[PDB]
């Protein structure tokens, strides 16, 4: 009996078709539905890491800027969970996954995944977690905007990639089916989100008790 | 003989003449000393540390606070520890312990001593810790500007000298001698400055193996 919304997460590395994915899910499972992206630049916390970003002069030590990102889940996880239990479903792009993969890739000394986790300890899991994967690079023909961000380096963006991997690999070997890894290697737009509703159309009829939750 | 300066660190709940104290121990080692105090507020995460603490209507979840505080470290610990080389003694007022203290006082679900920790984990461990323990917490909430402050009140205030007596006495127990108690009840600037001295020289004359560091 009784039930909750769905938590459908999109992750994968930079230029991957992930924004774009996830509002075709959202208008598709609207009305009763929310979409979510992080990093969630609107909130003052947000803001600090929108600047990092987009402006690569801006400073930061590693700890500080990944502790930030941390947060920025933390001042909205209460309404997600709120919005679960009114029902409505939701569609995040980004998540803990990213927030361990990023930090860990660059390697700086003591920020290894377990470290890199911890912050993010006692979030909800969710539902479903989506990993569009790809062997393409970087790839130009996929930027999200302008100049391009701090991280879009071939040479970084390789790095995270490895990272994504051993960390879902771990967690997957782990126990965890609740993690798809989906390639979108020269898929189009369509063709990527007939993938995804194949995997999420399922997920959405499943039952769920209101009252139950996974956290990290 | 020669050799990198000391990290001094005094902790306490509020109002228990850490500044004070921190200023006349730093002024006593000068030149060769540098004061740093914790929050450091002239950051931008600074800044919000800031208004959360001084206003009411800064809303921010206890986990989005807390990893706020460790972040403020983090943006200044190469600074401390470059200073530290050069054979700088750094008087600190307030660190980790009172991370993960006062956060953990607060009884949130999940967020515990272990869980308030791991952020700043990694982070240099000073050399010698100083806590200025009260038993008056009842006369502390008397000084003026009292309350006009977040975690300003009787009741908390209990709570946290609850949960740094736990966290101190695990530290402690657990086998750091690097940390003092000092009764500082009913005493006033003078003798406790006696007080502190005679824990305090000790250590700046010695020159523990190879002058290492330690972390958290
Ligand atoms: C949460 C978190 C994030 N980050 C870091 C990771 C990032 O480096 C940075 C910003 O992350 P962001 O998600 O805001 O980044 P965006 O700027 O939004 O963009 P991405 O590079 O991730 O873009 P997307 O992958 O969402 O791509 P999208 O916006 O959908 O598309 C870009 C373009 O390509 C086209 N496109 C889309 N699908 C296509 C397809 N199938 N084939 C060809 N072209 C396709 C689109 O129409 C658009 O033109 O945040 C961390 O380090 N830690 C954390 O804790
Ligand atoms: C590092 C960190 C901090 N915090 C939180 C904990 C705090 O609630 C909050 C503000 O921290 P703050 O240190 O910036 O706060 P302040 O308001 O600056 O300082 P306190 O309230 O702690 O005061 P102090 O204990 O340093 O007191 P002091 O300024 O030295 O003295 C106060 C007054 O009493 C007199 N006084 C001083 N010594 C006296 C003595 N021996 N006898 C009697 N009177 C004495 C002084 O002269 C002054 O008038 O930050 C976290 O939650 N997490 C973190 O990671």
Redesign the pocket.
């Known amino acids: 009996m009784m039930g909750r919304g769905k938590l459908i997460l999109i992750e ?1 590395l ?7 994915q996830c509002n075709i899910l959202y208008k598709k499972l609207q009305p009763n539905c929310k979409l979510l ?3 969630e630049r609107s909130t003052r916390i947000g803001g600090l890491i929108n600047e990092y ?1 987009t402006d690569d002069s801006f400073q930061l030590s590693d700890q500080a800027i990944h502790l930030l ?2 947060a920025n889940r933390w001042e909205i996880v209460d309404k997600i969970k709120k919005d679960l239990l009114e029902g409505k479903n939701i569609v995040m ?3 803990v996954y ?2 361990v993969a ?2 860990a890739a660059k390697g700086t000394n003591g920020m290894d995944l377990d470290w890199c986790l911890q912050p993010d300890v006692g979030l909800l899991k969710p539902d479903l977690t989506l990993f569009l994967s790809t062997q393409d690079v970087d790839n130009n ?5 302008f100049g391009d ?1 701090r ?1 879009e380096t071939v040479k970084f963006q390789e790095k995270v990639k490895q990272t994504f991997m051993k960390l879902l690999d771990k967690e997957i070997r782990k126990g965890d089916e609740s993690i798809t890894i989906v390639d ?1 290697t020269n ?3 369509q063709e ?1 989100e007939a993938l995804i509703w194949q995997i999420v159309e399922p997920v959405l009829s499943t039952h769920i008790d209101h009252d139950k939750f996974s956290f990290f």
């Open positions: 994968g930079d230029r991957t078709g992930k924004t774009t992206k992080f990093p970003l990102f941390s792009d980004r998540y990213s927030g990023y930090s023909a996929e930027k999200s905007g961000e991280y979108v898929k189009g737009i990527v």
